[PDB]
């Protein structure tokens, strides 16, 4: 099968946020009838004073927050809490419709000739590439035995029947 | 329904703490487009001439351009308008960055401030949510420093903040408004903001912004981007670096400043150093700049990245663009290192990087001459650099001699006396000009110095080359794809134009040709400042992606109003005349429209009189600079003509 | 007001010892400390000495599907791995999944214990966890580790298959 990788050169970004403009614009209904950076599937983490410019793409949906949130210090830069998470998470507004709260997820401009965010980034911080990768039931049994060992066979049995 | 614009504005009374959203008249849009144009309409019939700058009835308007918030590349400018405490005329100031588009996403086109707040406060906007917050804990804080504290307080990391420094709070006549890598710098609009007890304006927006013709509007947008690529592969041949490409003066990218340091005047616009740019200097400045520049950053939805984050050792990071890189350096006879360090202090304080440097150099000339004594400067340090840091703090606090210098070179010299007016030699309408004292009279720039409502030369020029090509082949090549011209005659003028001989300045181009050129260049700036389009992609650089031929299409598809080339030309003329009428009502006459006496060494009175006479005719004004009743009625400015007669400004017949 | 906890990670102080992987795997063995296995640690260190990359990554949220596109960063001269900052228990990689079953792993901050063990064993002090109060309510749909683990199996193998297997083990 083919996996597509979004290549993001944070060192090339200038924080124009053009990507947010075109992405939300296209996904309007009808297309380009309006725009709204809050509805963008790509969001730029921007702090000029910290020299941080990090384009983030909408990833997976999650119904619950993490028990602990992560916060990095890398190469002198103090990033934001959850600074790199692509999740549509109940802990913030990113990757969620500003009016309904519904989750947003990048689909690489499915159907279109080219990712619009990539196209409007005239400085070339963004590119998408492809590559092929290689795609048993013994894993199931071991996991179930793991679940029985950690929580108990009586607890496991009653949960499955629900 | 409305498009491009939101159709709503905010009316804030800082005296009563009242806030009100009001729908706008769609007719205003058809006549004055937006931004500067509609700002002018508001100031005209709400701010009579009897209103003083620091009077509660004075207005402070924050306007987002008509096309801000749309996918239009580079369209992100804010237009701040008020009555200047320095010039006593109208003052509109432009600011880049991300603030204007955020306002549109919040649902508003303008914010109009009246009255004054007794306590220091800031305005908080979040879509439909609008409230006034206390800002006493922010007193004295720097402009950028203030924004970061607020965004932590409110927990709004993605909110855009426009704030003033201590300079604005203390009503320095050349105090600015700072927002990230952007500044409403000139006119003293920061002084009015502080006078109203308004520390900052915070806005967050997450609403949609619509256009009338979606497919058509994005089409023009892509057309611009494509031109920007092609244009950046074909810079203007044989021009200097910071004039070959698009955008604002790319002085943060180019280390070469030979044209600047050898043609512009150092100190109080005084000294010319013909041979300053040596090898030792060029290497020392490049080293300082490589070490100080962290990243080249852009404004909202623009690939040009003109600004740059500047990090000096032991100092907080600030952002810089264009000519402020040299003004502090050249005014103090120092180096680029000193300039970058003091600019950090000045940006935080919120001072104009043009006037401030000239005011301090003006003060030291007076101290040098003996017009000012050492007793006026107590505890004055020895070093030249230390003296500027010293005087800077004295000004922002209005402390002693700093209280007088805080009024500008004009008013300061007026108060000082003893021949101090002689050293205020670089003012037009009480406003400091660019430090340029050239040799031969320039017929095109003469007009721009005399009539420019912004009273700044860098913000009226652009579309016509500043100098002619020596060889005819170069000209033919240039006019080949010069599609931006309104008329073929602009090509023919540049073809005949030569640096030396029978077709050189000041006698060529002719008086009629000069008037047409000045009218075109000015028209593009007024279109920019109404739509919100950054001049860097329009009226400033040669052969821009935005021009008189596609602009009408952007307006039509974006706002959903009928618009063509001629109707657009007339529109720009309409509120450019209205701005003129505003200054006429405030006492401006032809007498005020003269360059500094020493601006050129070779003057031609008879040619200058013919130039100003002919230009007035083209504009449709009097021989005293006043818009006639005929042209006012033709423009749909009949109410102006009536009030002129009623006020005796114009005679009936 | 509720409490949110933050894992503070100073990757500039990390040395790539991976002592954090040892103790977490050890404590979460059954019974505790009976064995250890970095591949089942809920903290996993991104480590390329030649690139000077040392990044502790804590197991996060479960997802039964991969994204439509994976991201890959270049930041401050360093070329990090694809998905190099993602905390998800994802079917696209082995990180934060049991090497033998495929079950999801998730850091609960050693819930029940006196202190997070990884932090306790990181003597160079690259890790730390702090608390703070917030006003925003917790709208997390809180599912138990038991429930999430069973659901991941049910999606992978089917409810009827999982059920029959369960009744053939108990
Ligand atoms: C070359 C010019 C066109 C004028 O500079 P120069 O070449 O020095 O022109 P000069 O007038 O000094 O005379 C030179 C010498 O030639 C002589 N002479 C002259 N004419 C003739 C003749 N016809 N025939 C014969 N001789 C003639 C003349 O006598 C003199 O010789 P002397 O020493 O007296 O014996 C250019 O530098 C310029 O800036 N001009 C545009 C206007 C302007 O200021 N725009 C910029 C606005 S700021 C901006 O945009 C910006 C700011 C910050 C950031 C970003 C942007
Ligand atoms: N519409 C408009 N855009 C403009 C200008 C202007 O006067 N009007 N000034 C230009 C110049 S010369 C500079 S240096 C920058 C300054 O940007 P700032 O006001 O955000 O600091 O704006 C550029 N864009
Ligand atoms: N403090 C400060 N003053 C400044 C600037 C600036 O960036 N910061 N820009 C200068 C330049 S290059 C220009 S073109 C004008 C911008 O005009 P405006 O902000 O009044 O519209 O201000 C000048 N004064
Ligand atoms: S358009 Fe490009 S440079 Fe601009 S913010 Fe997006 S990724 Fe960064
Ligand atoms: S945003 Fe991501 S890292 Fe933060 S709590 Fe949500 S799922 Fe966890
Ligand atoms: S690739 Fe397409 S869907 Fe994804 S962020 Fe860019 S424009 Fe939006
Ligand atoms: S050209 Fe420069 S000043 Fe204009 S919008 Fe782009 S980055 Fe900003
Ligand atoms: S114990 Fe600390 S320094 Fe060692 S690998 Fe773990 S986090 Fe890094
Ligand atoms: S590991 Fe994370 S970022 Fe990568 S595909 Fe899975 S959920 Fe998406
Ligand atoms: S806090 Fe505890 S459970 Fe979480 S990774 Fe560290 S040792 Fe493991
Ligand atoms: Mg400005
Ligand atoms: W400028």
């Amino acid at each position: 099968r083919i996996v597509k990788t979004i290549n993001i050169d944070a060192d090339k970004c200038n924080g124009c946020r053009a990507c947010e403009v075109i992405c939300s614009a296209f996904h309007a209904m009808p297309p380009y009838s309006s725009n709204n950076p809050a509805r963008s599937r790509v969001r730029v983490v921007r702090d000029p004073l910290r020299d941080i410019y990090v384009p983030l793409y909408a990833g997976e949906y999650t119904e619950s927050e993490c028990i602990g949130r992560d916060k990095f210090i890398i190469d002198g830069k103090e990033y934001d809490e959850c600074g790199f998470c692509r999740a549509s998470c109940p802990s913030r507004d990113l990757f969620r419709e500003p009016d309904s709260g519904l989750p947003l997820k990048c689909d690489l401009c499915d159907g279109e000739p080219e990712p619009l965010c990539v196209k409007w980034c005239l400085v070339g911080a963004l590119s998408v590439t492809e590559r092929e990768v290689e795609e048993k039931r013994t894993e199931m049994e071991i996991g179930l035995e793991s679940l029985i060992s950690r929580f108990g066979a009586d607890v496991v049995a009653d949960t499955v029947e629900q | 329904m409305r498009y491009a614009e939101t159709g709503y504005v905010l009316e804030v009374d800082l005296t009563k703490g009242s806030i009100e959203r009001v729908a706008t008249d769609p007719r205003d849009t058809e006549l004055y487009l937006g931004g500067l144009g509609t700002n002018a309409k508001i100031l005209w019939d709400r701010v009579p001439p009897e209103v003083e700058p620091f009077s509660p009835e004075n207005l402070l308007i924050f306007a987002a351009g008509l096309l801000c918030g749309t996918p239009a590349t580079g369209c992100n400018r804010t237009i701040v308008s008020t009555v200047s405490p320095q010039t006593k005329l109208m003052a509109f100031s432009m600011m880049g960055g991300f603030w204007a588009p955020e306002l549109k996403y919040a649902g508003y086109d303008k914010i109009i401030f009246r009255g004054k707040s007794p306590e220091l406060v800031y305005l908080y906007i979040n879509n439909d949510k609008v409230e006034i917050r206390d800002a006493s804990h922010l007193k004295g804080k720097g402009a950028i420093e203030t924004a970061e504290i607020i965004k932590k307080e409110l927990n709004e990391p993605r909110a855009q903040v426009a704030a003033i420094g201590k300079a604005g709070e203390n009503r320095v006549f050349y105090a600015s408004i700072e927002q990230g890598r952007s500044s409403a710098s000139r006119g003293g609009i920061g002084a009015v903001m502080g006078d109203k007890g308004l520390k900052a304006v915070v806005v967050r927006g997450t609403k949609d912004l619509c256009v009338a013709k979606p497919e058509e509007y994005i089409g023009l947008c892509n057309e611009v981007l494509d031109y920007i690529k092609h244009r950046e592969e074909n810079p203007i041949p044989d021009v200097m670096p910071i004039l070959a490409g698009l955008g604002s003066p790319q002085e943060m990218k180019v280390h070469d400043e030979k044209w600047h340091t050898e043609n512009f005047n150092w100190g109080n616009a005084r000294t010319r150093r013909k041979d300053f740019w040596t090898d030792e200097v060029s290497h020392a400045w490049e080293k300082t700049m490589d070490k100080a520049r962290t990243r080249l950053i852009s404004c909202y939805n623009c690939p040009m990245k003109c600004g740059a984050t500047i990090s000096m050792e032991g100092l907080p990071t600030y952002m810089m663009k264009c000519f402020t890189k040299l003004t502090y350096t050249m005014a103090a006879y120092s180096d680029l290192d000193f300039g970058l360090r003091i600019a950090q202090k000045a940006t935080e304080y919120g001072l104009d990087g043009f006037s401030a440097p000239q005011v301090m150099a003006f003060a030291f000339e007076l101290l040098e001459k003996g017009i000012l004594k050492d007793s006026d400067f107590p505890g004055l340090p020895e070093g030249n650099e230390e003296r500027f840091f010293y005087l800077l703090d004295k000004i922002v606090n209005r402390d002693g001699i700093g209280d007088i210098l805080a009024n500008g070179t004009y008013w300061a010299a007026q108060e000082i006396g003893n021949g101090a007016e002689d050293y205020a030699h670089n003012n037009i309408k009480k406003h400091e000009q660019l430090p340029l004292k050239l040799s031969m009279l320039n017929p095109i720039y003469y007009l721009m110095y005399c009539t420019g409502e912004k009273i700044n030369i860098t913000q009226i020029e652009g579309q016509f080359p500043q100098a002619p090509y020596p060889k005819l082949e170069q000209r033919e090549a240039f006019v080949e794809d010069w599609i931006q011209v309104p008329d073929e005659k602009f090509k023919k003028i540049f073809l005949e134009w030569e640096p030396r001989g029978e077709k050189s300045m000041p006698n060529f181009p002719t008086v009629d040709m000069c008037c047409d050129i000045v009218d075109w260049q000015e028209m593009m700036h007024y279109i920019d400042d109404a739509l919100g389009q950054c001049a860097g992609l329009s009226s400033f650089p040669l052969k821009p992606p935005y021009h008189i031929h596609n602009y009408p299409k952007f307006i039509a598809a974006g706002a959903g109003i009928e618009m063509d080339t001629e109707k657009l030309k007339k529109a720009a003329k309409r509120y450019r005349t209205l701005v003129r009428a505003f200054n006429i009502r405030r006492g401006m006459r032809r007498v005020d429209e003269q360059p500094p006496a020493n601006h050129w060494k070779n003057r031609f009175p008879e040619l200058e009189k013919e130039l100003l006479d002919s230009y007035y005719k083209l504009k449709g004004w009097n021989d005293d600079g006043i818009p006639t009743k005929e042209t006012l009625d033709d423009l749909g400015l009949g109410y102006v003509g009536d009030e002129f007669i009623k006020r005796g400004i114009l005679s009936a017949g």
Side-chain angles (χ1 to χ4, degrees), chain A residues 1-131 133 137-153 156-157 159-160, chain B residues 1-239 241-653:
Chain A
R1 61 184 178 92
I2 296 183
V3 310
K4 294 143 173 289
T5 295
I6 309 168
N7 302 282
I8 312 164
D9 196 331
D11 294 337
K12 277 187 172 182
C13 180
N14 55 46
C16 66
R17 292 173 42 200
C19 39
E20 295 183 1
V21 180
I22 188 54
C23 178
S24 44
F26 168 73
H27 289 101
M29 300 167 299
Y32 308 105
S33 66
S34 61
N35 83 94
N36 190 346
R39 306 184 182 272
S40 173
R41 286 106 177 105
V42 55
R43 301 292 298 270
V44 179
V45 176
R46 185 182 183 272
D47 189 348
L49 298 176
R50 289 185 287 162
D51 191 46
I52 297 174
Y53 313 83
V54 182
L56 252 196
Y57 285 75
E60 284 301 343
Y61 171 73
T62 171
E63 60 182 345
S64 73
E65 307 171 13
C66 298
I67 298 173
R69 304 178 182 175
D70 66 340
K71 183 175 188 300
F72 286 104
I73 297 182
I74 308 172
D75 298 331
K77 294 180 173 183
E78 304 189 20
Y79 291 85
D80 293 324
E81 176 185 88
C82 303
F84 293 95
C85 186
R86 309 218 273 135
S88 188
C89 177
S91 65
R92 80 283 180 85
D93 290 317
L94 284 196
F95 311 128
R96 300 176 59 187
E97 296 282 28
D99 48 348
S100 62
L102 292 180
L104 302 177
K105 178 175 179 179
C106 178
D107 68 334
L108 294 183
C109 288
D110 181 273
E112 298 300 302
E114 176 185 16
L116 294 164
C117 56
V118 171
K119 181 185 180 182
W120 276 38
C121 185
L122 269 61
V123 304
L126 310 178
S127 67
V128 295
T129 60
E130 296 179 341
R131 83 179 190 274
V133 302
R137 207 183 114 179
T138 64
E139 289 187 353
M140 171 192 60
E141 187 174 351
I142 293 186
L144 290 175
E145 293 178 332
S146 175
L147 290 174
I148 291 176
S149 293
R150 181 172 299 268
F151 297 117
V156 172
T159 303
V160 169
Chain B
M1 122 112 60
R2 318 283 288 276
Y3 305 96
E5 59 175 343
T6 67
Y8 297 102
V9 302
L10 273 175
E11 295 282 357
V12 175
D13 198 325
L14 294 176
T15 297
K16 295 176 169 54
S18 61
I19 305 175
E20 180 184 349
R21 190 184 75 161
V22 181
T24 55
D25 189 342
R27 179 185 172 93
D28 287 327
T29 301
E30 289 181 355
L31 298 175
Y32 315 102
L33 298 184
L36 171 63
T38 45
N39 279 19
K41 182 59 173 58
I42 294 178
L43 289 180
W44 167 260
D45 50 29
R46 284 181 56 178
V47 185
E50 41 269 3
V51 174
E52 299 292 349
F54 293 155
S55 157
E57 286 68 43
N58 187 12
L59 294 184
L60 173 61
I61 311 177
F62 284 82
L66 171 62
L67 293 184
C68 295
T70 63
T73 303
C75 194
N76 50 23
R77 248 61 189 176
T78 299
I79 303 80
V80 184
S81 298
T82 191
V83 177
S84 168
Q86 182 185 27
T87 71
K88 305 302 188 185
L89 304 173
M90 175 187 180
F92 59 94
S93 183
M94 273 68 64
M95 164 187 292
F98 304 78
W99 196 91
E102 191 75 33
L103 185 69
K104 301 294 288 290
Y105 292 133
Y108 316 96
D109 287 312
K110 300 182 189 294
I111 312 177
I112 303 126
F113 290 102
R114 59 174 279 95
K116 303 183 180 185
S117 185
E119 311 296 350
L120 198 65
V121 299
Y122 71 83
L123 182 65
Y124 179 30
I125 298 176
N126 192 319
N127 290 334
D128 294 336
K129 178 185 176 183
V130 190
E131 66 184 18
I132 297 179
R133 298 293 202 85
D134 180 90
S136 56
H137 61 294
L138 298 165
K139 183 181 181 180
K141 304 279 187 173
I144 299 306
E145 170 186 16
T146 292
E148 295 307 297
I149 301 180
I150 286 184
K151 285 184 290 193
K152 297 200 173 192
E153 293 179 7
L154 297 172
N155 188 23
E156 295 269 43
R158 281 180 168 85
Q160 308 292 344
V161 180
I164 53 176
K166 187 193 301 180
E169 299 187 48
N170 294 333
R171 306 173 188 176
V172 180
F173 282 6
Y174 36 102
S176 58
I177 307 175
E178 301 294 327
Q179 179 249 147
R181 63 138 291 176
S182 314
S183 174
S185 308
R186 311 251 282 162
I189 68 287
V192 174
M193 184 166 171
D195 178 46
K196 300 192 173 304
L198 183 58
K199 176 61 176 183
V201 179
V202 185
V203 58
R204 177 79 178 119
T206 51
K207 288 182 175 180
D208 297 321
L209 197 69
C210 303
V211 280
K213 311 291 188 179
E215 350 74 24
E216 181 177 338
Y217 195 85
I218 205 58
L220 295 162
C221 283
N222 283 312
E223 196 175 3
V224 167
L225 287 176
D226 288 14
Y227 191 92
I228 292 177
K229 306 177 187 178
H230 175 263
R231 174 74 165 84
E232 286 304 288
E233 299 174 2
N234 298 264
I236 313 302
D238 290 308
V239 182
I242 57 184
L243 278 203
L246 293 176
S248 310
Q250 309 280 2
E251 303 203 43
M252 308 308 291
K253 302 177 181 177
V254 184
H255 72 274
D256 184 30
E257 296 281 9
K258 179 176 178 299
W259 180 74
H260 272 138
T261 58
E262 290 184 345
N263 287 318
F264 285 68
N265 289 26
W266 294 64
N268 189 26
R270 182 69 60 185
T271 305
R272 189 194 190 95
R273 306 162 84 173
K274 294 184 178 182
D275 309 318
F276 176 85
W277 198 256
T278 65
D279 279 328
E280 299 183 1
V281 167
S282 193
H283 281 140
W285 281 28
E286 187 187 24
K287 189 176 184 179
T288 298
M289 190 62 180
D290 283 339
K291 181 186 301 181
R293 184 182 59 242
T294 301
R295 188 183 304 228
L296 292 170
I297 65 178
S298 291
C299 302
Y300 187 62
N301 196 30
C302 188
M304 301 313 298
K305 51 180 177 176
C306 302
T309 44
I310 300 296
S311 186
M312 305 301 296
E313 190 178 39
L315 294 183
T317 295
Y318 72 108
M319 281 127 288
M320 168 185 289
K321 100 291 293 181
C322 197
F323 196 57
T324 11
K325 168 194 174 188
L326 298 186
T327 56
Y328 287 98
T329 294
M330 294 181 61
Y333 296 134
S334 189
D335 61 347
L336 180 54
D337 176 86
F338 158 79
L340 293 176
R341 306 173 71 80
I342 197 178
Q344 192 277 321
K345 268 295 206 307
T347 300
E348 272 297 86
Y349 282 150
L351 286 173
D352 175 34
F354 276 6
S355 298
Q358 281 190 48
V359 172
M360 292 182 291
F362 157 84
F364 289 142
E365 276 192 345
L366 294 186
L367 180 57
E368 187 72 25
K369 175 77 171 184
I371 303 178
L372 263 69
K373 317 306 293 297
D374 276 275
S375 56
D376 300 327
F377 305 87
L380 183 59
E382 261 266 309
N384 182 37
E385 275 79 359
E386 294 74 14
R387 284 188 172 186
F388 268 78
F389 281 96
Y390 166 88
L391 186 52
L392 187 63
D393 284 347
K394 299 284 291 183
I395 292 186
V396 295
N397 290 281
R398 285 189 168 273
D399 177 33
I401 190 61
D403 187 32
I404 302 181
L405 299 172
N407 301 328
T409 63
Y410 183 90
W411 296 110
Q414 183 122 324
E415 186 175 12
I416 292 175
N418 293 23
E421 301 90 337
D422 300 336
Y423 293 86
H425 66 94
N426 200 24
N427 285 325
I428 290 181
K429 305 176 187 179
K430 305 179 182 65
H431 195 56
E432 287 73 9
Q433 300 300 291
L434 269 289
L436 272 167
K437 307 295 180 178
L438 305 183
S439 171
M440 187 61 63
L441 174 67
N442 193 310
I444 292 180
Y445 275 75
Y446 166 81
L447 286 175
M448 295 193 301
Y449 279 117
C450 291
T451 63
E453 305 302 347
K454 182 64 160 67
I455 324 171
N456 184 17
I457 198 69
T458 63
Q459 305 179 262
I460 193 166
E461 67 181 349
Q463 290 312 293
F464 206 87
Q466 300 181 14
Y469 282 111
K471 308 154 71 66
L472 175 59
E473 298 82 65
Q474 302 169 307
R475 317 195 197 108
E476 300 173 347
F478 182 85
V479 300
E480 172 66 10
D481 50 334
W482 198 6
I483 67 183
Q484 293 80 2
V485 298
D487 191 286
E488 288 288 302
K489 61 181 183 176
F490 290 101
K491 298 183 180 182
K492 297 166 185 171
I493 299 180
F494 188 72
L495 285 174
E496 305 180 54
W497 193 18
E498 297 179 342
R500 292 295 194 266
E502 284 211 352
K503 306 277 182 161
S504 64
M505 288 174 170
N507 295 290
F508 191 94
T510 70
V511 174
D512 283 340
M513 296 182 185
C514 291
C515 291
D516 287 341
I517 296 178
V518 171
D519 177 81
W520 176 32
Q521 288 179 149
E522 187 187 52
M523 176 180 60
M524 302 317 302
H525 279 270
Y526 277 76
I527 296 180
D528 287 4
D529 292 347
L531 269 46
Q533 188 64 52
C534 177
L537 299 179
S538 188
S539 64
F540 194 86
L542 292 181
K543 298 184 178 181
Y546 296 95
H547 49 75
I548 198 63
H549 299 305
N550 67 327
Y551 250 152
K553 295 181 174 60
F554 270 103
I555 301 178
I561 66 178
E562 177 179 320
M563 190 60 58
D564 56 76
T565 289
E566 302 309 310
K567 187 182 303 301
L568 175 53
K569 293 175 179 175
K570 185 166 194 171
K573 183 181 181 179
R574 186 178 291 104
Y575 60 87
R576 184 273 177 267
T577 299
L578 179 57
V579 170
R580 180 53 165 237
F582 184 91
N583 290 330
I584 297 301
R585 193 172 68 178
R586 293 202 69 91
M588 188 180 69
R589 297 300 184 269
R590 179 195 180 115
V591 205
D592 304 285
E593 305 207 305
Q594 311 176 31
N598 61 7
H599 225 54
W600 298 277
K601 292 182 182 180
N602 293 69
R603 297 294 293 262
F604 307 93
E606 179 170 320
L607 173 59
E608 300 168 9
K609 180 180 181 298
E610 180 182 333
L611 277 169
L612 199 47
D613 290 343
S614 298
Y615 187 76
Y616 281 176
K617 223 69 176 181
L618 179 57
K619 302 276 94 169
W621 305 343
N622 278 4
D623 59 335
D624 195 29
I626 312 173
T628 72
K629 176 75 172 180
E630 214 179 60
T631 55
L632 284 178
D633 288 324
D634 174 72
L635 288 170
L637 296 169
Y639 54 92
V640 175
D642 295 339
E643 182 169 358
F644 272 174
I645 299 178
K646 187 175 180 293
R647 289 185 188 261
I649 298 178
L650 278 182
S651 300

